[PDB]
Design an enzyme around this catalytic site. Structure first.
Site, mmCIF file in Angstrom:
data_model
loop_
_atom_site.group_PDB
_atom_site.id
_atom_site.type_symbol
_atom_site.label_atom_id
_atom_site.label_comp_id
_atom_site.label_asym_id
_atom_site.label_seq_id
_atom_site.Cartn_x
_atom_site.Cartn_y
_atom_site.Cartn_z
ATOM 1 C CG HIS A 56 77.357 83.056 65.730
ATOM 2 N ND1 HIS A 56 77.757 81.974 64.978
ATOM 3 C CD2 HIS A 56 78.349 83.251 66.698
ATOM 4 C CE1 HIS A 56 78.914 81.527 65.469
ATOM 5 N NE2 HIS A 56 79.255 82.287 66.544
ATOM 6 C CG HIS A 94 79.395 75.935 68.576
ATOM 7 N ND1 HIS A 94 80.450 76.735 68.889
ATOM 8 C CD2 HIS A 94 79.023 76.273 67.323
ATOM 9 C CE1 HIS A 94 80.580 77.660 67.976
ATOM 10 N NE2 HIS A 94 79.723 77.385 66.974
ATOM 11 C CG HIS A 124 79.128 74.425 63.740
ATOM 12 N ND1 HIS A 124 80.467 74.418 64.048
ATOM 13 C CD2 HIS A 124 79.032 74.969 62.471
ATOM 14 C CE1 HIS A 124 81.139 74.892 63.009
ATOM 15 N NE2 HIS A 124 80.286 75.256 62.069
ATOM 16 C CG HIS A 152 77.008 77.461 58.811
ATOM 17 N ND1 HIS A 152 77.556 78.642 59.253
ATOM 18 C CD2 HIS A 152 77.873 76.452 59.148
ATOM 19 C CE1 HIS A 152 78.838 78.376 59.780
ATOM 20 N NE2 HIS A 152 78.976 77.042 59.805
ATOM 21 C CD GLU A 181 79.044 78.709 56.373
ATOM 22 O OE1 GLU A 181 78.882 79.919 56.530
ATOM 23 O OE2 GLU A 181 79.985 78.018 56.758
ATOM 24 C CG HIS A 212 80.693 73.379 58.868
ATOM 25 N ND1 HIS A 212 80.618 74.692 58.808
ATOM 26 C CD2 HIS A 212 80.449 72.948 57.538
ATOM 27 C CE1 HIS A 212 80.559 75.133 57.552
ATOM 28 N NE2 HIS A 212 80.400 74.039 56.770
ATOM 29 C CB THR A 219 82.613 79.664 57.044
ATOM 30 O OG1 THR A 219 81.846 79.099 58.136
ATOM 31 C CG2 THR A 219 83.206 78.504 56.216
ATOM 32 C CG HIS A 220 82.065 81.977 62.070
ATOM 33 N ND1 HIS A 220 82.867 81.977 63.240
ATOM 34 C CD2 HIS A 220 81.196 80.937 62.193
ATOM 35 C CE1 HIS A 220 82.536 80.875 63.975
ATOM 36 N NE2 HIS A 220 81.501 80.241 63.322
HETATM 37 C C1 LIG Z 1 89.482 79.534 66.499
HETATM 38 C C2 LIG Z 1 88.950 78.180 66.929
HETATM 39 C C3 LIG Z 1 87.957 77.696 65.863
HETATM 40 S S1 LIG Z 1 86.406 78.705 65.904
HETATM 41 C C4 LIG Z 1 85.628 78.062 64.396
HETATM 42 C C5 LIG Z 1 85.479 76.699 64.236
HETATM 43 F F1 LIG Z 1 85.877 75.783 65.171
HETATM 44 C C6 LIG Z 1 84.873 76.204 63.070
HETATM 45 F F2 LIG Z 1 84.768 74.871 62.940
HETATM 46 C C7 LIG Z 1 84.429 77.088 62.038
HETATM 47 S S2 LIG Z 1 83.699 76.559 60.471
HETATM 48 N N1 LIG Z 1 82.164 77.206 60.484
HETATM 49 O O1 LIG Z 1 84.614 77.068 59.429
HETATM 50 O O2 LIG Z 1 83.484 75.093 60.657
HETATM 51 C C8 LIG Z 1 84.553 78.434 62.271
HETATM 52 F F3 LIG Z 1 84.137 79.333 61.352
HETATM 53 C C9 LIG Z 1 85.152 78.935 63.457
HETATM 54 F F4 LIG Z 1 85.285 80.281 63.614
HETATM 55 ZN ZN LIG Z 2 80.729 76.076 60.276
#
Ligand SMILES: CCCSc1c(F)c(F)c(S(N)(=O)=O)c(F)c1F
Ligand SMILES: [Zn+2]
Length: 258
Positions: free
Chosen positions: A62, A65, A92, A94, A104, A117, A197-198
């Site tokens: 999706h 990273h 990463h 979006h 977002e 992010h 956010t996911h």
């Molecule tokens: C459970 C370990 C974290 S997985 C993860 C994450 F690291 C994020 F930075 C984000 S984000 N996109 O909020 O930065 C995210 F949505 C994630 F699901």
């Molecule tokens: Zn993110």
């Protein structure tokens, strides 16, 4: 996985598998600048990242990273709303299906073309990401809104690496890279308590949203959308979008450092 960004498995439907999707501390949000509260106890954001902590780039189906070594405090975020030091582990982006949307967070309703992010975990209090990821004070994520315009040269090493991770699950070394080079020159910010956010959508994130955008061109955005969500040798399925809609504030206050 049981989730994605398609109509059937996407954000609108996430609450069926992940009930916290309808929680009180969900992200992203629309930052309404007339409803922000200036907070004078907020210190400046301090980033100090060591490029030798860059590790690997991965296509996760999706998104993609860029992960970092997080065994020690070589790369850390401090300051702002935090008293604790937070250790860098990943950055990463979006994006959206066209330039019109893709961020977002929104600011006063305005949608940007993507969002960066830069994610960190609280190593003062916890011993690992896995431990931190579900704690209210576990994660700190810097988000930078990306405004379609001039090509951004600082994205180059990232973009050049995409051809080695075209399809789901490919991964490659990605080394000697300091993601502070991607941040805007002003680090004035908004901050609010929210979530991943996911899925798994944990309400564990203190968001640091930069006031200044960085650029990106419409062709660099196309490079993200040309990554493929399928595995090697299946029908090619471009990664058209991966942004979640904004969620209700539910009484939270967004604070401004400026
Ligand atoms: C459970 C370990 C974290 S997985 C993860 C994450 F690291 C994020 F930075 C984000 S984000 N996109 O909020 O930065 C995210 F949505 C994630 F699901
Ligand atoms: Zn993110």
């Amino acid at each position: 996985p049981d989730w994605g960004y398609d109509d059937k498995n996407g954000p609108e439907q996430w609450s069926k598998l992940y009930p916290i999707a309808n929680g009180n501390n969900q992200s992203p949000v629309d930052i309404k600048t007339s409803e922000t509260k200036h907070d004078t106890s907020l210190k400046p954001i301090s980033v100090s990242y060591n490029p030798a902590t860059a590790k690997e780039i991965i296509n996760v189906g999706h998104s993609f990273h860029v992960n970092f070594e997080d065994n020690d405090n070589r790369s850390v975020l401090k300051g702002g709303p935090f008293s604790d030091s937070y250790r860098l582990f990943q950055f990463h982006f979006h994006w959206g299906s066209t330039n019109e949307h893709g961020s977002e967070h929104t600011v006063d309703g305005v949608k940007y073309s993507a969002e960066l992010h830069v994610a960190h975990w609280n190593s003062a209090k916890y011993s690992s990401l896995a431990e931190a990821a579900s704690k209210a004070d576990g994660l700190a994520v810097i988000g930078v809104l990306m405004k379609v315009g001039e090509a951004n040269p600082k994205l180059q090493k990232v973009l050049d690496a995409l051809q080695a991770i075209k399809t789901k699950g490919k991964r490659a070394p990605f080394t000697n890279f300091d993601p502070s080079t991607l941040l805007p020159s002003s680090l004035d910010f908004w901050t609010y308590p929210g979530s991943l956010t996911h899925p798994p959508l944990y309400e564990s994130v203190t968001w640091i949203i930069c006031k200044e955008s960085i650029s990106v061109s419409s062709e660099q955005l196309a490079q993200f959308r040309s990554l493929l969500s399928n595995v090697e040798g299946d029908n090619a399925v471009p990664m058209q979008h991966n942004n979640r809609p904004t969620q209700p504030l539910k009484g939270r206050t967004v604070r401004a450092s400026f």
